[PDB]
Ligand binder design. Structure first.
Ligand SMILES: NC(=O)C[C@H](N)C(=O)N[C@@H](Cc1ccc(O)cc1)C(=O)O
Ligand SMILES: NC(=O)C[C@H](N)C(=O)N[C@@H](Cc1ccc(O)cc1)C(=O)O
Lengths: 697, 697
């Protein structure tokens, strides 16, 4: 079924859920802290679920990848080898910034948010500041009880606001990862593709302090005891079976203006794809020379590969469904249905005119802004800018500090400085600085007008780039102890430093704050125009009998449907892959190099009690017509009785354009079968202690 | 069904033919001069069929490609634009060497053939001379009457010989080619692939003299009047329907020794694929600088692309099926079942050992021969060699003159020299010479042992190479008038010449004569072993209950089966593509750039009365489980009633390794549907005259 439904829309989908084959009462799904919705957790960018009363959490391999990478070395490469913790004391810290978010409360605060915004009057900057102040005040009251973290969400262009309250678990530990040849079987070749043969799962455990409250990593912390956890399905999942997913999809753009789509399609996607492919080649080469570079950059390399391929896929999808034409036709239909509405349709019409006007601004600057933005987010330089910015915000009252630099953010900023120790090699950062400066100096003189960067380059040729990178090479911010000292320093200490990266951060900061003010002004202009126009598109969609649900915004959504394949001319993709399909893709070369224990077990047909007689094998991955996107990785797939049948992890090639224009015919979720998760942990990369904790043997 | 069955095996397959759904009687197929088998013709390298009483001939577009290419220019480009002859007098000559062969009779000459080898003593070089002299004279006697070509065919190793008598039509004209965007839709992306959306068809017309003798192009020649032609099917072809193919498969190697295979798998296919891909980037890049080079090399570029991708497919198929393992499992089981025969065993076992001994001889030379052989079959040099070789062979008598330089070949040679006119560019041929020399002077010293070439280079680097390519540039064999002058010259004239390429021709020839004598020795040894060993295999296979049928050898063969898809894990390929699948592949860029009339007709559902309701569209290509290979292109696909339902043109990716080890699971023929052929000539690139002549519209 189409739609990323908010829990508040359960009454609207209760009928369709039952019709598709849900056997729980839809009222059971409305209890978001009860069984089974309360077992579903957010990780920040990924979804997961509790699967034991001792706080075992299951997610995707590609979601645990960062945690596995932080715990890898060139000699003891867990990304390659996998990992198991036979006892609680063997479990590895997933890193200081790993989180498990357990939902406590959702509060509708629409009337209060709109009243704060209207109270600002006509000043766009005051409007942006009023919503910021309202956001901070709501979150401060909601976070007064220790161990809770709150977030304000904006839905449907700012027509609805809800405050989420979560228990914020801060001590997350790695329990199990299959080898990378299972967790990431077929690598970037099979990424965004069906048929798929990927064992994309891994396990964490949530810990709390001995007092029961969230705490950073400590030896005397103890497993979290969740109220609810999911059980693995006893009923075999088959073709046509009902499935549903609860999770935290990140961002969709289905309510984008036609010109927002056109800019993304003609500039953003092809440009990012081109540069990311070129940076990835540089990182791959550096990794072949030094396995420490390969391990330190592995999370960055996987993320960048996934984004570049996704973008190429969206561009192919747009041509497949003529997204440009569908956008143009819908925008024309809305603007005509408004006109026929008389005076009542004039505000929305004028909101549209204001948003249309906002687009033009980001032409002629957009290549400069990309290169300078990427240069400033290289490791040493980005740490310098963050650290200098924090020293400035520290001197203000907490309520007046920029979102991201308040007291409630200090442990996250510190965590980032710590995690950089496992993700930084000076010789690799130098090559990334060179790459983005080289793009900047290759711009036309009118466009390469960043005055501070022009002063530091003092040239526009290869010699000038090399010269600036040589100077910045004198930085001490590669040192963890140096970063942690700067984290505590006042703004005068930064302004007196002769560290070249710190000098650079001090030089660029005035122009960074001015650019922030311009953004906040544009934000304040959208806070009145975007809701009026997006409400009109929704009203028009409702008048046309179309499904109305908000674009994804990192909050909890429900999607449902059935196990099923899809087709193109001369091809029908069947809903399951099987063990024999993994072995048929074997080449013995990364990324089609399965463990010997897997190839041996498939050759012997060791199906370990997990064979589905309908398939004649153990299923590996499956397709269904659910509506997921980035953020839904690791979402539990529940059957008709709310039992776990698999994890969401990817979409088929033709699905990725559904970010902009939903296509029901070729949009499928790719999930890993819970039976393959069990088979890997039984026959290939054993976790007997885990199968026991899951009551699976 | 497996098997390239010779017509004499029709008794063996008459059951299967009827169980498969043949409505004709198998007796009716036995009559090779009858309906429909008499409508089937050989083009030498392609199959075709008579489709009208006025000698109208149907084949594939990639079969007519050479003809279209000979009639194309950078200004008037019939590859890109296509072609139509509304009247007989608009039909363009297909080329001097373009042929239609009509089968007249087959006679078994086994006994007489084995005598000619037996009574040669037991010397190698005498048996080479012996069989040749027996073939030469047996063909002369068969080609008594003016308008016939005959050929001796070596089957099942030499356990069968047969003589083929054909009427040789020497005036073939192009009637119709669709646009290259239709005839070669998907180009080398979609080549050897399903799903496929290629209208791979074109029409010739066969011409004779007014007397009724075949004759060369004369403007007063008349259309041939075949005794039989095929009718287009009126019954709509669907999934599971019976189909059969009759045609002229070139070469299969399912009876080769494990060592012949392992040499091909380990050296020949990887080396040729590597060097052809490099040579193809040269032609590609050069063709982009010169729109004249592109047209002139288009035929060799298409051919080499086809072979390079085929060899990559074979290598992957060998790994999929464990070709190496199955062969050594057969070549070991044969030798055991012969050591279990005792007395009857020993000839087969000795015969094996003789062939085993002939394998290693090439090992230190292959990289040299290939690079040299290639350099020497360069155009300028290749012309220069063959002319001088003829001027040498002229002064000898017939029946002692080497086959291919005889009286009956003289017309074919001049053909070559004329055709070269539309296939030659100096700076391309130099680039080509440059490549194959650059490869030669890359070899180690001990292998870089061409007396003449190292001589002519004086050094072994890019400078020495550039030296000789710029020397050979001085030639004037780049002129047709020059080439035809030398065609009729005597020998002494060649030796006097100061043309660098004639001089090179003269210099290399003694070494060429020597190497061919040795070549002829080598074959001699084989002519007694091969029949002995392959007959044991044939009986070992017979004993196991495996289909027994000889390797393809350019003679007439029957294959049959049913319209059906194939699969692999997660995917079922359905047996038909449709118009909508063509549209869906549209990118506006080569090779996914359909005629606007096709995209417009599709969008509008102009199905033109050709829709199959079971598909809800007009079908484009279809799959079936027949057994075809190179040479089968253009073969008519016949339904249950012996009506034309399409033309064979390709195989799916997995099918190509069946050249060594047949696999019935993933071997399918790809054929173009007769309704797509009609549809194209109705709605897209019109041919109302052909529609009339075929009795369709
Ligand atoms: N290695 C992977 O498989 C990552 C995967 N391509 C991915 O990015 N998954 C995201 C989930 C997703 C599912 C379906 C669609 O259409 C988009 C995104 C995720 O990581 O959350
Ligand atoms: N352009 C093409 O489609 C050429 C095609 N790949 C080809 O080589 N066809 C040959 C026929 C053939 C069919 C099936 C198999 O397995 C091999 C070859 C041909 O030209 O005869």
């Amino acid at each position: 079924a189409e739609g990323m439904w908010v829990p508040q829309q359960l009454p609207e989908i209760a009928g369709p859920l039952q019709k598709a084959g849900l056997k729980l009462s839809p009222e059971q799904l409305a209890n978001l802290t009860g069984d089974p919705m309360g077992a579903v957790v957010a990780l920040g960018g990924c979804t997961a679920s509790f699967v034991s009363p001792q706080g075992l959490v299951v997610t995707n391999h590609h979601c645990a990848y960062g945690a596995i990478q932080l715990n890898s070395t060139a000699q003891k490469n867990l990304i390659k080898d996998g990992f198991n913790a036979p006892t609680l004391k063997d479990e590895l810290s997933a890193g200081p910034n790993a989180r498990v978010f357990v939902l406590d409360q959702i509060t509708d605060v629409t009337a209060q948010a709109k009243a704060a915004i209207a109270g600002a009057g006509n000043d766009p900057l005051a409007r942006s500041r009023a919503l910021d102040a309202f956001d901070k005040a709501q979150v401060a009251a909601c976070e007064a009880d220790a161990g809770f973290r709150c977030r304000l969400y904006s839905f449907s262009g700012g027509n609805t606001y809800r405050l989420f309250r979560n228990m914020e678990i801060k001590d997350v530990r790695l329990v199990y990862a299959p080898p990378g040849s299972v967790g990431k079987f077929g690598g970037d070749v099979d990424n965004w593709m069906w048929p798929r043969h990927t064992g994309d799962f891994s396990f964490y455990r949530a810990y709390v302090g001995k007092d029961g409250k969230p705490a950073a990593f400590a030896a005397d912390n103890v497993p979290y005891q969740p109220k609810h956890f999911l059980k693995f399905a006893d009923q075999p999942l088959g073709a046509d079976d009902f499935v549903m997913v609860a999770g935290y999809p990140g961002r969709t753009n289905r309510y984008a203006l036609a010109g927002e789509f056109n800019e993304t399609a003609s500039f953003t996607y092809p440009t990012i794809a081109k540069h990311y492919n070129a940076v990835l080649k540089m990182i791959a080469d550096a990794g072949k020379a030094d396995a420490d570079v390969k391990v330190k950059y592995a999370a960055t390399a996987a993320s960048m590969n996934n984004v570049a391929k996704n973008y190429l896929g969206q561009l192919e999808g747009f041509k497949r469904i003529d997204a440009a034409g569908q956008k143009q036709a819908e925008e024309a239909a809305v603007l005509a249905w408004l006109k026929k509405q008389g005076a009542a349709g004039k505000p929305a019409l004028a909101a549209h005119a204001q948003l249309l006007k906002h687009l033009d601004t980001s032409k002629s600057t957009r290549e400069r802004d990309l290169f300078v933005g990427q240069f400033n987010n290289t490791s040493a330089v980005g740490a310098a800018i963050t650290l200098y910015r924090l020293s400035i915000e520290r001197s203000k009252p907490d309520a007046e500090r920029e979102a991201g630099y308040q007291e409630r953010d200090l442990t996250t900023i510190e965590g980032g400085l710590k995690q950089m120790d496992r993700r930084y090699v000076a010789k690799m950062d130098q090559q990334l600085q060179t790459y983005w400066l080289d793009q900047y100096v290759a711009l036309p003189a009118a466009q390469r007008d960043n005055e501070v960067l022009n002063k530091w380059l003092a040239g526009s040729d290869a010699a000038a780039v090399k010269s600036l990178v040589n100077k910045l090479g004198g930085t001490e911010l590669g040192s963890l102890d140096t970063r942690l000292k700067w984290f505590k320093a006042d703004r005068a200490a930064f302004e007196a430093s002769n560290d070249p990266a710190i000098q650079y951060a001090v030089a660029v900061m005035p122009a960074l704050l001015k650019q922030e003010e311009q953004k906040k002004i544009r934000e304040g202009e959208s806070l009145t125009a975007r809701p009026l126009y997006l409400q009109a598109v929704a009203d028009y969609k409702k008048s046309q009998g179309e499904f109305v649900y908000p674009d994804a915004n990192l909050s909890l959504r429900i999607t449902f449907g059935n196990v099923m394949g899809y087709g193109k001319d001369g091809v029908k993709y069947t809903p399951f892959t099987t063990l024999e399909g993994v072995a048929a893709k074997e080449t013995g070369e990364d990324p089609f190099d399965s463990p010997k224990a897997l190839l041996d077990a498939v050759k012997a047909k060791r199906y370990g009690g997990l064979e589905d007689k309908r398939l004649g094998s153990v299923p590996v991955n499956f397709l269904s017509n659910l509506d997921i996107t980035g953020g839904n990785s690791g979402s539990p797939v529940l059957d008709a009785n709310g039992k776990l049948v698999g994890l969401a992890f990817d979409g088929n090639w033709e699905s990725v354009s559904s970010n902009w224009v939903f296509d029901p015919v070729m949009t499928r979720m790719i999930a890993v079968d819970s039976r393959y998760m069990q088979w890997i942990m039984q026959e290939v990369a054993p976790a007997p202690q885990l199968l026991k904790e899951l009551n699976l043997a």
